[PDB]
Amino acid sequence: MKLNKQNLTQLAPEVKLPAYTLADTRQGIAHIGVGGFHRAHQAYYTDALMNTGEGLDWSICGVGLRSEDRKARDDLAGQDYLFTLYELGDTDDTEVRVIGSISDMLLAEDSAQALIDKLASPEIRIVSLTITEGGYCIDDSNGEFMAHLPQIQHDLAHPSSPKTVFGFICAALTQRRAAGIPAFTVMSCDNLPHNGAVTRKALLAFAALHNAELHDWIKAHVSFPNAMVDRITPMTSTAHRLQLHDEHGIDDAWPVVCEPFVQWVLEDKFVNGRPAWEKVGVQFTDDVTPYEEMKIGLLNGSHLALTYLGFLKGYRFVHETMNDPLFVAYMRAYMDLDVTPNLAPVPGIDLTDYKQTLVDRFSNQAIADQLERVCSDGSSKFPKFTVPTINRLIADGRETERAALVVAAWALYLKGVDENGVSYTIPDPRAEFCQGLVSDDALISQRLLAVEEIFGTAIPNSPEFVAAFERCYGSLRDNGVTTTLKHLLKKP
Numbered sequence: 001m002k003l004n005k006q007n008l009t010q011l012a013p014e015v016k017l018p019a020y021t022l023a024d025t026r027q028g029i030a031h032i033g034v035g036g037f038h039r040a041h042q043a044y045y046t047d048a049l050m051n052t053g054e055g056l057d058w059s060i061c062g063v064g065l066r067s068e069d070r071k072a073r074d075d076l077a078g079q080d081y082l083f084t085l086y087e088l089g090d091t092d093d094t095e096v097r098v099i100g101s102i103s104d105m106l107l108a109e110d111s112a113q114a115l116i117d118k119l120a121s122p123e124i125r126i127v128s129l130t131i132t133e134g135g136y137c138i139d140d141s142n143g144e145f146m147a148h149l150p151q152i153q154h155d156l157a158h159p160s161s162p163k164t165v166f167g168f169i170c171a172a173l174t175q176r177r178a179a180g181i182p183a184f185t186v187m188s189c190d191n192l193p194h195n196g197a198v199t200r201k202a203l204l205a206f207a208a209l210h211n212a213e214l215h216d217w218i219k220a221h222v223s224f225p226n227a228m229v230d231r232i233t234p235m236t237s238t239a240h241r242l243q244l245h246d247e248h249g250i251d252d253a254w255p256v257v258c259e260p261f262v263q264w265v266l267e268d269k270f271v272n273g274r275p276a277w278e279k280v281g282v283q284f285t286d287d288v289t290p291y292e293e294m295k296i297g298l299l300n301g302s303h304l305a306l307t308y309l310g311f312l313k314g315y316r317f318v319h320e321t322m323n324d325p326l327f328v329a330y331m332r333a334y335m336d337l338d339v340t341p342n343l344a345p346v347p348g349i350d351l352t353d354y355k356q357t358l359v360d361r362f363s364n365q366a367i368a369d370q371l372e373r374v375c376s377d378g379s380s381k382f383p384k385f386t387v388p389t390i391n392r393l394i395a396d397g398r399e400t401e402r403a404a405l406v407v408a409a410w411a412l413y414l415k416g417v418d419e420n421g422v423s424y425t426i427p428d429p430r431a432e433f434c435q436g437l438v439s440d441d442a443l444i445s446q447r448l449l450a451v452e453e454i455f456g457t458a459i460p461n462s463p464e465f466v467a468a469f470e471r472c473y474g475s476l477r478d479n480g481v482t483t484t485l486k487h488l489l490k491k492p
């Protein structure tokens, strides 16, 4: 049965349906970057609130700034913006639920002004983001906003026909001001240690390139809450979509699949209101940064440590690496010896138990999370997930070998062929550029480690780290992933 409003009451019995009248919802959030995570997390909690009969005025209007967003818009529009949330887990108490909290999705390609108008409408009180780890344009080595990027220069030159998130948000805020409409809160839901602070720094830096006045007004009227957002959400591959039809009879052009576990801890900093998400499990705390630092360092850091080595070994899913005891031992050593000592205190959390839950969640066999997804965009993910840890090891004079292996694994992985002879394309926005850095084995450490917006300035200037990187890369190439891990796991 095709998922749409017409068929909503004719799906399998076990399928949970929105308990509110879809036609009575009104928009309050504009979400930029409608992919899987937004749908499995923010749209999920908002739909859960609506099912209690509250917050029906907090519907989401999706926003797509990229050509690839057209397919998402068309797939959802063909379902009256309904989509299936399909939870997959082993120690499972999982549900299949139709989500009705997204009511539309606008594309910049259809009209820049229609999108500005939507973002500037008084009903829209929060502009949320899942624009990916590298979408904020801040160079982590020096904390500088990357004003020179072409799309940023484009928006400065054509503020009324922007293409980036910064250009759209500034144009919307200017229009709201001219109408006497209050600012909205900008709510980042991306994996950055201090995601709200980064969003603030970037938007202000961009606004400053326009005029001090817009910059000053934004600094004083817009809030940028930090958050820890957590819910493993694989890509919806054909197999995931077919499994939904096979098991629950729904023909959904684009369901979202995700693990049963879900958490959201937010700083309560909203200038123009927000849904009562705490009624459905969202947690609010004064300073969420140590929790987000913790999750990024341990969960995302471990994901990168597993993913390139796993792809090279020939694995294709996260649970497969967890079925390899050498990978599990390596992740535990990385988490316990390299990351843990660097973490700020996390009130109410026992780190040992938390690290075990990461092992448990990554071991979920039913979810089938793709290493191709986890590997994607390493050029933007390294400075967020791994380099901070490496820099601390370098500064402390601590062993860098396990962390260096992650970077060496990525370097070898960029050549595009695994140990079984299977060739792959590199899913990275700077793929061509990164593959170029590894065209000559003898020059890899000099070229790859010298990209400042990826690795910073400590790594290339560290003899200890460079030697470890070179040892690791040669071992991976000559002896393979398995033998390299065995040797490493025996170092003191």
Ligand SMILES: NC(=O)c1ccc[n+]([C@@H]2O[C@H](COP(=O)([O-])OP(=O)(O)OC[C@H]3O[C@@H](n4cnc5c(N)ncnc54)[C@H](O)[C@@H]3O)[C@@H](O)[C@H]2O)c1
Pocket (backbone or CB within 6 Å): 032, 033, 034, 035, 036, 037, 038, 064, 065, 066, 068, 069, 130, 131, 132, 133, 134, 135, 165, 189, 190, 191, 192, 229, 230, 231, 232, 233, 234
């Ligand atoms: N997938 C997960 O398990 C998970 C968990 C926690 C947080 N996240 C966060 O959410 C993000 C998106 O993950 P996803 O799985 O939904 O990915 P996805 O590939 O399904 O969607 C990414 C979305 O971002 C848009 N996008 C990319 N670059 C952009 C840019 N510069 N400006 C505006 N939009 C841009 C894409 O067009 C698309 O709509 C991650 O990068 C991460 O920060 C994901």
